[PDB]
Motif scaffolding. Structure first.
Motif, PDB file in Angstrom:
ATOM      1  N   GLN A   4      -0.470   7.868  17.099  1.00 56.19           N
ATOM      2  CA  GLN A   4       0.600   8.170  16.320  1.00 56.19           C
ATOM      3  C   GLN A   4       0.589   6.998  15.162  1.00 56.19           C
ATOM      4  OE1 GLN A   4       2.327  10.695  16.193  1.00 56.19           O
ATOM      5  NE2 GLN A   4       2.113  11.811  18.138  1.00 56.19           N
ATOM      6  N   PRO A   5       1.582   7.248  13.856  1.00 57.38           N
ATOM      7  CA  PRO A   5       1.386   6.098  13.034  1.00 57.38           C
ATOM      8  C   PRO A   5       1.854   4.954  13.658  1.00 57.38           C
ATOM      9  CG  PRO A   5       2.317   8.205  12.110  1.00 57.38           C
ATOM     10  CD  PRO A   5       2.118   8.459  13.551  1.00 57.38           C
ATOM     11  N   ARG A   6       1.554   3.663  12.676  1.00 52.44           N
ATOM     12  CA  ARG A   6       1.779   2.388  13.259  1.00 52.44           C
ATOM     13  C   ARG A   6       3.283   2.159  12.918  1.00 52.44           C
ATOM     14  NH1 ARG A   6      -3.199  -0.613  12.544  1.00 52.44           N
ATOM     15  NH2 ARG A   6      -4.754   0.800  12.312  1.00 52.44           N
ATOM     16  N   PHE A   8       5.501   0.408  11.084  1.00 51.91           N
ATOM     17  CA  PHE A   8       5.966   0.285   9.709  1.00 51.91           C
ATOM     18  C   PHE A   8       5.934   1.589   8.972  1.00 51.91           C
ATOM     19  CE2 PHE A   8       1.834   0.291   7.264  1.00 51.91           C
ATOM     20  CZ  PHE A   8       0.867  -0.348   8.510  1.00 51.91           C
ATOM     21  N   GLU A   9       5.038   2.463   9.474  1.00 50.19           N
ATOM     22  CA  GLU A   9       4.613   3.779   8.978  1.00 50.19           C
ATOM     23  C   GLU A   9       5.709   4.687   9.233  1.00 50.19           C
ATOM     24  OE1 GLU A   9       0.692   4.126  10.285  1.00 50.19           O
ATOM     25  OE2 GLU A   9      -0.147   4.189   8.308  1.00 50.19           O
ATOM     26  N   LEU A  10       5.932   4.773  10.883  1.00 48.71           N
ATOM     27  CA  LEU A  10       7.248   5.587  11.351  1.00 48.71           C
ATOM     28  C   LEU A  10       8.379   5.175  10.879  1.00 48.71           C
ATOM     29  CD1 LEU A  10       6.195   4.984  15.049  1.00 48.71           C
ATOM     30  CD2 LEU A  10       5.603   6.976  13.876  1.00 48.71           C
ATOM     31  N   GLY A  12       9.253   4.317   7.869  1.00 50.29           N
ATOM     32  CA  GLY A  12       9.270   4.768   6.418  1.00 50.29           C
ATOM     33  C   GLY A  12       9.732   6.515   6.641  1.00 50.29           C
ATOM     34  N   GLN A  13       9.816   7.052   7.774  1.00 45.22           N
ATOM     35  CA  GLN A  13      10.216   8.517   7.938  1.00 45.22           C
ATOM     36  C   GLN A  13      11.627   8.446   7.991  1.00 45.22           C
ATOM     37  OE1 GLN A  13       7.739  10.366  10.825  1.00 45.22           O
ATOM     38  NE2 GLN A  13       5.827   9.474  10.353  1.00 45.22           N
ATOM     39  N   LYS A  17      13.432   6.154  11.090  1.00 49.13           N
ATOM     40  CA  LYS A  17      14.119   4.948  10.511  1.00 49.13           C
ATOM     41  C   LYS A  17      15.494   4.921  11.130  1.00 49.13           C
ATOM     42  CE  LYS A  17      13.735   4.538   5.910  1.00 49.13           C
ATOM     43  NZ  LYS A  17      12.984   3.284   6.043  1.00 49.13           N
ATOM     44  N   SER A  38       8.296  -4.640   9.966  1.00 49.08           N
ATOM     45  CA  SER A  38       7.538  -4.010   8.800  1.00 49.08           C
ATOM     46  C   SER A  38       6.034  -4.945   8.773  1.00 49.08           C
ATOM     47  CB  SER A  38       8.212  -4.459   7.706  1.00 49.08           C
ATOM     48  OG  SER A  38       8.428  -5.602   7.342  1.00 49.08           O
ATOM     49  N   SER A  41       0.794  -4.276  12.837  1.00 50.30           N
ATOM     50  CA  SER A  41       1.225  -3.157  13.848  1.00 50.30           C
ATOM     51  C   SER A  41      -0.262  -2.267  14.221  1.00 50.30           C
ATOM     52  CB  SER A  41       2.027  -2.104  13.597  1.00 50.30           C
ATOM     53  OG  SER A  41       2.286  -1.100  14.306  1.00 50.30           O
ATOM     54  N   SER A  59       4.888  -4.383  16.810  1.00 52.60           N
ATOM     55  CA  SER A  59       4.397  -4.987  15.580  1.00 52.60           C
ATOM     56  C   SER A  59       4.737  -6.345  15.872  1.00 52.60           C
ATOM     57  CB  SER A  59       5.486  -4.532  14.432  1.00 52.60           C
ATOM     58  OG  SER A  59       6.690  -5.056  14.441  1.00 52.60           O
TER      59      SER A  59
END
Length: 130
Positions: A4-6, A8-10, A12-13, A17, A38, A41, A59
């Motif tokens: 799954q996304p890192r 900091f990427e998660l 951003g959703q 968030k 942030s 990660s 992270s």
């Protein structure tokens, strides 16, 4: 398990968030780096714990990464998150050898013992962690 996304990427959703923000309700003296989450990660993993899905993310504190680690478990449905902040002292040198014996842990989101263990397993996936 699935990549799954890192973290900091998660974060951003809109969904992740919001769940993350909710986790800190009522917490005091939370370091800025922890609430931001942030920094660097490695890839997250979605997996199952006795038939319940979680997204396990991580992270660390920029420029003090080894000594300041964050592990997160989001419910698969994104309705709650649980967190583990790990702190290591700078000395003695043996901290690098057996960090588990020196670490201070702080838990976020009031996780169950089983979710605590799931977060410790993620931490322990670092091959140098002992």
């Amino acid at each position: 398990g699935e990549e799954q996304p890192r973290l900091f990427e998660l974060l951003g959703q809109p969904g992740y968030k919001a769940t993350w923000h909710a986790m800190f309700k009522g917490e005091s003296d939370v370091p800025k780096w922890v609430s931001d989450a942030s920094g660097p990660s490695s890839p997250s993993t979605s997996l199952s714990l006795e038939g319940q899905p979680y997204v396990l993310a991580n992270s660390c504190k920029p420029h003090d990464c080894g000594n300041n680690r964050l592990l997160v478990a989001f419910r698969g449905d994104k309705s709650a998150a649980y967190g583990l902040q790990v702190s290591l002292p700078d000395e003695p040198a043996e901290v690098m050898q057996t960090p588990s014996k020196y670490a201070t842990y702080r838990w976020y989101g009031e996780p169950s013992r089983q979710v605590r263990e799931l977060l410790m397993k993620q931490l322990e996936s670092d091959p140098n962690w002992k």
